[PDB]
Amino acid sequence: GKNIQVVVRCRPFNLAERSAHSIVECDPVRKEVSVRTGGLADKSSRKTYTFDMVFGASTKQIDVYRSVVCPILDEVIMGYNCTIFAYGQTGTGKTFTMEGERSPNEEYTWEEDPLAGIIPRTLHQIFEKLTDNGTEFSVKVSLLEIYNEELFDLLNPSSDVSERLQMFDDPRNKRGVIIKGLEEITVHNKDEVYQILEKGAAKRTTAATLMNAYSSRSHSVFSVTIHMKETTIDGEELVKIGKLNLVDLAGSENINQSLLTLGRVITALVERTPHVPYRESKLTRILQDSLGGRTRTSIIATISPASLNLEETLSTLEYAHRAKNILNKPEVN
Numbered sequence: 001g002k003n004i005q006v007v008v009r010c011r012p013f014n015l016a017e018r019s020a021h022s023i024v025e026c027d028p029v030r031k032e033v034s035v036r037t038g039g040l041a042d043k044s045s046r047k048t049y050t051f052d053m054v055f056g057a058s059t060k061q062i063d064v065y066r067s068v069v070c071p072i073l074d075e076v077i078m079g080y081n082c083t084i085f086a087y088g089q090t091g092t093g094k095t096f097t098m099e100g101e102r103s104p105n106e107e108y109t110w111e112e113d114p115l116a117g118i119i120p121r122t123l124h125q126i127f128e129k130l131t132d133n134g135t136e137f138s139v140k141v142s143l144l145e146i147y148n149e150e151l152f153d154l155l156n157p158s159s160d161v162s163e164r165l166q167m168f169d170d171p172r173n174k175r176g177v178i179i180k181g182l183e184e185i186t187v188h189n190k191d192e193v194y195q196i197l198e199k200g201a202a203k204r205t206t207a208a209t210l211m212n213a214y215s216s217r218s219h220s221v222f223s224v225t226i227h228m229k230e231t232t233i234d235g236e237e238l239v240k241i242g243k244l245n246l247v248d249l250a251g252s253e254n255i256n257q258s259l260l261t262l263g264r265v266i267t268a269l270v271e272r273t274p275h276v277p278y279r280e281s282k283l284t285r286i287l288q289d290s291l292g293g294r295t296r297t298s299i300i301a302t303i304s305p306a307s308l309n310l311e312e313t314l315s316t317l318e319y320a321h322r323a324k325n326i327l328n329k330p331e332v333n
């Protein structure tokens with residue numbers, strides 16, 4: 001098989017956009033997204049697509065999590081490598097979804113903030129779930145940013161802020177690679193996560209001021225690895241290793257080698273062309289497994305309601321729809 005998952009999430013209007021009206025309507029039950037392509041004179045022309053899941057503007061973070069992220073976490077705990085990423089135009093919610101936002105004036109703890117996104121939630125759930133099944137386990141996390149074909153580690157303490165790091169192909173996995181010098185931190189309890197993110201958050205900032213049009217132009221890849229012990233009825237011991245990669249892509253509005261290449265790889269997979277160009281960009285190289293690989297991958301494509309962004313929105317959905325045909329064969333480690 002076995003197919004990958006694509007879901008669409010559309011954000012609500014800004015204060016700013018309030019005074020417009022939407023051309024996008026998502027009907028979750030039917031799993032469709034409809035966009036009005038006509039402008040002011042047609043109103044009846046629509047483009048509609050069907051995705052595995054569709055989340056409208058009414059959707060809270062919690063819902064997104066339960067709907068797509070939870071199931072994935074189950075798999076990760078079983079030993080699968082899972083990748084989830086966000087794709088969309090800038091300003092449409094990728095960053096929000098994957099990481100979320102922290103509400104102001106400590107109203108909520110990090111754990112209960114409802115603006116929190118997938119990453120922090122995921123980190124939280126992991127400790128809960130794992131802890132609740134007894135068993136020895138450990139968590140390692142890493143975060144890297146890819147800007148302009150250069151990789152920067154956001155968790156490194158080093159004052160060698162932008163030391164480019166190097167990757168090599170990994171022999172153990174033919175579709176994978178290792179990044180030498182990438183810091184991986186072992187997180188021992190839920191109480192250490194926030195500190196990491198925050199730290200990570202800061203370092204990203206520095207780099208922002210280290211280079212041109214950052215946020216919107218680079219990709220961030222967050223990864224968690226989990227090793228859990230299990231015992232069979234026969235005393236044989238099992239070790240499961242699972243990895244979840246959560247990535248926040250660069251705006252689809254777009255030096256952009258990683259993104260282009262990605263589109264290219266996708267086309268190749270979908271069309272069956274004999275040689276697929278994973279090697280052409282740093283990003284595709286690390287996500288090779290995800291696309292046509294051994295991992296289960298989910299893509300969240302985020303779009304916006306505003307009339308203004310119609311062309312981008314349409315393209316975002318086109319892209320998403322066609323990615324639905326990638327096939328992966330998920331396997332357990």
Ligand SMILES: Nc1ncnc2c1ncn2[C@@H]1O[C@H](COP(=O)(O)OP(=O)(O)O)[C@@H](O)[C@H]1O
Binds near residue numbers: 012094
């Ligand atoms: N589903 C949503 N619900 C509420 N606010 C959202 C949603 N999606 C995006 N936003 C808001 O819109 C702004 C842009 O989102 P951002 O996360 O930066 O998207 P991108 O990474 O695609 O630029 C942020 O202020 C964020 O709070």
Ligand SMILES: CC(=O)/N=C1/NN(C(C)=O)[C@](C)(c2ccccc2)S1
Binds near residue numbers: 100113200
């Ligand atoms: C790599 C990464 O995701 N870094 C983060 N730093 N955060 C801080 C400081 O609030 C985020 C936005 C968050 C949001 C809600 C709840 C908890 C954390 S996520």
Ligand SMILES: [Mg+2]
Binds near residue numbers: 090094095215216
């Ligand atoms: Mg962004």
